[PDB]
């Protein structure tokens, strides 16, 4: 109880996590997808809706078109986002937002107008008493109970990096890279055509994504793994499509995740995630690098490939001096790391003074977000 | 016990020595540095201070800025000095100064206002029952148990000279030189850039200082030492930085301490320390010079370079007549020579009458320091 | 050099063959294999059991037409060996033992398609050398250009690929299923609303010939349907082989419109005007200017009247108004791929990239995917 | 005169070359070496494997730009020999066998940087003589002065050095890391807050051109941000090569401000107005009066509008109010170093300090650090 009962929402990109503050796990998880009917629509007395949002669209995806409003972190369809927020407040959580402060998350290095429009909708359409916006990668350090370390948060829209030393951030050592899990699915679709399988419908992008989540893995070494797959056939697995017609996957199993370390497979000029996180460490001060090397933290859904922790260690020690020690912390839960940190933050007694009240918004306007109250 | 238990404090410049009177060694040694946070400061519930003073600033020097209150000996930041004195009385010594007379040190040829402000702070903010101020180089003769001799006290702020003959000082033969250990570190930073190493951050000045304290040494002869280093590579040592990336030092090893004997490397017009101490001897009376030549005393931290005692002897006998004998006394301990003399002085039964009492300060004011009670 | 290299363009539904260094292909004939359907009374006739090529078109009234290539990928390997034998001994009248050959292949195809083609040529026909090239790359050789974006639409598949100063961008290549074969099927379906039925596979040729002579692309679709709804000045007559002339109304300009609106059949992909715009925006920022002014058209299905003006109108509606957009349409389009192949197989610098018999024996059929494509 | 000495200014990001005794450099081109990135289809093109100079700028859409020099020090010695070959045979069209050359070097640089430059010129190119001079010393020759303090800020490093009546003070020389290259990177970061992304190394040239045309220095920073917050009269438009014009607001005057407030990136050093004040106070007491009234500006990165008035305002806030302070800004600033080099290499008294081939053979590469600098 306590009559405060703050709310936590993690918009993300492609997955929505919602729940109450002070719990252990989110109470509602569902994709952020809005669908529209495509075909003629014969017969009568059915009483069927004109748009489906959430898990309902996944069930009926065979006749309707999937569309994603949020992309690369920035929201592009504001009319669709108000539909998703209405679904996770009245239909799933079954709560009235009039007496419930909410907490939201935002990726680093985003357009300023993205934050301002979110504040207008919550404070006017939903009439929340208070609200807040926090960086996703900062909350990931609250979950682990740490104060020092470098966090690599890779999700579906964008992966970013930020170092923190004893509760102080370094804004000039923050790196952002577009490569994410959405671009990995598209690459898998392209290289699957070389075996004879065609997946072009937007409703068939979910079929390819499910294959990636179950079969793909990261190889420790790329040159000699392609040699073993070229001769023997012990690296093949079978997948059953919904209508049947089972398929076989060969060396494409470990080729799609490799794009993270070699982003030249799509055509980008940036370096891999192992070199991006090394440049951030070398951008900080000299005497704080030692504690940053031994406190590498992994978070995000796209980081749960098997063998990704061992591959990252091998590449990092090849660049760093051989004297020091390097370790990577990978908690058993990674997808909900951001939400857990948000629940912890919204329960401290010292945090109850940094809420953005309704009175402040009326006097100052939507520009109050960029002030000392972030 | 004895319920008197006088206190001894040596402010210095860059190092603070504190302890009780009648002991063998100081009980508290820590740098005189005050630091301020530099970066944004994300996170909550940390409860972190706004300023760190002493050994705490050295540990966290990677995010904060180091600042020194005393320069060339005189105090420039009076607000910061009250912070250091509070740290060495309640936090480190763990004592109440209300029932503890204190003894302080001061360099020769200093502004008059420097002494007056020190008396005001101790007698009003801390409410000491008594206090005293003594010259640093006079106390260095108490430690050695001598009465005659010339003392060259070189520290971090300023080096000075003063001759004493059988308990009588000669104020007109006192020489003060600007060069000290702080200017030696800056010269090492400049000549290190010719090999490819850059050290510009104020927190990186501690890295360069530690190299000087471990590798540098004084060469007996400068012309032929540069010839051996030019051909062979047997004069090089390696240093490991905190993050790794070991470095190599060549002929810069013996070039930085040479500035003491040749102050033209920075641009000063004054003579070296070997000629400054010779002019002081020739400024005294004719028949007392014989005892001054054979009683040369070395004190201070910056005088603990290897080979500095033999180099000083070689240059001095080149100027003095060849008939007489010249020797230099270098005790195994040199950094604590001033503190040891202060402890001895504050324990004699005949010294208990020259304390500056609270009653005298109230009646006369801060100008009582310049009277017969120094 | 006395090489006299050979050039062959398999395509899908039309075969172009000839010698290297000439101006036009020497043999053009459909790729169709037919089988008798009826009883077969009478004696002393001495009639064959299968007809391939132009022979099947003449006798299509008693036999069934079958296509071995669908959307580009070969599905009947036994029938393809029959077609290749026809274009080497019966039409070209040549012995392939002393004649290097050049073949074409569409982008984004199964890997096994290339490997099986190499096995047949190097073993059944015993060619001394062979090569495989992309169809849309050869279309730029014919025009004598080095920069530009090529939209090659044929009978099986239309594809797009940008090239800038002799460098390709493999990540900006788009492939679309829609082609000329799906346009004929749509015409058959909408012809039933007037009373005409065309269901036999030998009657698909009747509908195709109507499309090649009457259909055209309209500049605007909304107001063209208004003029056809009121007046009857947009109707033409076609005479069937046995007579019974027919009339075509607004179906004349409705079948080609499927290219710009692929929702008429049920596909979710965008039209050819939006597919080629996405490819341009997928490249680098400073090379887009030269790509806008060097749009090249090739392929048989691109020879609809008014298709060049319609493409220009839609493209400038999306691109910024500052720059200029033009489309290059050579007077010959069906033979653009073959002409580029003849030019490539004659340069002195190309004589080193042939896949020799010695290399195939040592390495095997996997040599195609190596540096020698 | 058969001597015809050569002058070369390597710099960092721009190369100035020409003959001695002229008015302006004859060849100016960026110091960039590019490598192809993509597949490279097509044949008969005959295209090179690396482009250096202005050629790489034209074709930057398919290749990667790389800079050999960084912060004054040369990091890629294999690439530098390619640039020097380009400015001697391809652009200047001269044979260096009978042409003494003059080179420039920044203060407080690694000793090995000077030695390697002497080896390449005296062995690979076989010059009869050569010399190396400090960049900021040559800037005083152009103005025809003898006393003054020179602040030379370029693309790699800004440095300061006071000179009084032909005598230098080596102990009052300050070197700062901040330069024009770090200003471009800051502009890229703060441009993302409006929605524009510039991440490709070929897109760093787009951002640099915006800085050279729109950015300016504001006299006061606190009240300028107030006017830009309310009105929209401080916005200008820029047209990208493909179109899609953009708008710049208060970022117009925020990027150059980093010079006076280097805490925007994270550096702890003071601004250029306080660095030049500390150098003056490091000299002797009676020579400061002539140094205050002879402040000289040189370098490309000093040609921001309003930079001369802003520097004056901050300097007089620290110096005593009795004396007068002025800043000399010649109409030409980018070529100030080259002009001084041409003047020096023409005096009759300078013809004795050349480093001859005979001296190098007898002494070796260490002759550079001797009395003949
Ligand atoms: N077990 C797994 N293996 C590989 N990838 C996964 C796995 N589980 C999820 N993913 C990928 O992670 C993405 C989800 O990331 P998520 O944590 O939801 O980020 P966000 O909250 O920003 O959407 C999906 O696109 C999916 O492709
Ligand atoms: N072993 C050593 N060799 C050379 N220099 C030293 C050594 N130890 C200390 N120093 C120098 O001496 C200085 C400390 O002098 P110190 O005795 O503390 O004088 P003060 O008490 O006036 O600060 C330091 O700056 C350091 O550079
Ligand atoms: N004049 C024309 N107008 C419209 N369509 C045509 C015309 N001529 C040919 N076509 C179409 O083009 C197709 C032939 O394309 P073609 O160039 O042979 O491609 P491929 O070589 O891949 O078979 C035929 O199916 C036909 O429908
Ligand atoms: N008009 C201008 N306004 C602002 N900056 C400029 C202008 N012209 C040139 N610059 C900057 O000056 C730099 C060139 O400096 P330059 O004189 O070439 O030094 P160097 O010779 O050491 O390369 C470029 O990086 C550019 O950003
Ligand atoms: Mg996330
Ligand atoms: Mg001392
Ligand atoms: Mg074709
Ligand atoms: Mg320059």
Author numbering:
A (entry chain A), B (entry chain B): 2 to 375
C (entry chain D), D (entry chain C): 3 to 375
Q: From the publication, what sentences describe this entry?
A:
Actin isoforms are among the most ubiquitous and abundant structural proteins that facilitate the functional organization of the cytoplasm of eukaryotic cells. Actin isoforms share high sequence identity at the protein level (~93–99%) and the propensity to self-assemble into helical, polarized filaments (F-actin) from monomers. To determine the structural characteristics and differences between actin isoforms, we solved the high-resolution structures of single-isotype skeletal muscle α-actin (3.37 Å), cardiac muscle α-actin (3.07 Å), ß-actin (2.99 Å), and γ-actin (3.38 Å) in the filamentous state using cryo-EM. Our 2.99–3.38 Å resolution structures of filamentous actin isoforms show that the N-termini of bare muscle and nonmuscle actins have different orientations that contribute to distinct binding interfaces for myosin motors and likely other ABPs.
Skeletal muscle α-actin and cardiac muscle α-actin were purified from rabbit skeletal muscle and the left ventricle of a bovine heart, respectively. The structures show local resolutions ranging from 2.1 to 3.5 Å for skeletal muscle α-actin, 1.9–3.3 Å for cardiac muscle α-actin, 1.5–3.0 Å for ß-actin, and 2.1–4.4 Å for γ-actin. For skeletal muscle α-actin and cardiac muscle α-actin, we could resolve the N-terminus starting from amino acids E4 and D2, respectively. The lack of resolvable density for the very first amino acid of cardiac muscle α-actin and the first three amino acids of skeletal muscle α-actin may be attributed to a nonuniform PTM pattern of native actin isoforms prepared from muscle compared to our recombinant nonmuscle actin isoforms with uniform PTM pattern in that the entire N-terminus region could be resolved. Like in previous cryo-EM structures of muscle α-actins, there are no resolvable densities for the very N-terminus, including Nt-acetylation, in our density maps of skeletal muscle α-actin and cardiac muscle α-actin, possibly due to nonuniform PTM patterns of native, tissue-purified muscle actins. In addition to Nt-acetylation in β- and γ-actin, we could resolve the methylated H72/H73 (H72Me/H73Me) in all cryo-EM reconstructions of actin isoforms. The inward movement of the D-loop (RMSD ~0.91 Å) is also observed in the recent structure of cardiac myosin bound to the thin filament compared to our structure of bare cardiac muscle α-actin, suggesting that myosin and not the regulatory proteins tropomyosin and troponin drive this structural change. Amino acid I287 is in hydrophobic contact with I208 and L242 in muscle actins and buries a surface area of ~113 Å2, whereas the interaction between V286, I207, and L241 in nonmuscle actins is less hydrophobic and buries a surface area of ~83 Å2 in the transverse interprotomer interface. Near the nucleotide-binding cleft active site, amino acids C10 and V17 in muscle actins are substituted with V9/I9 and C16 in β/γ-actin.
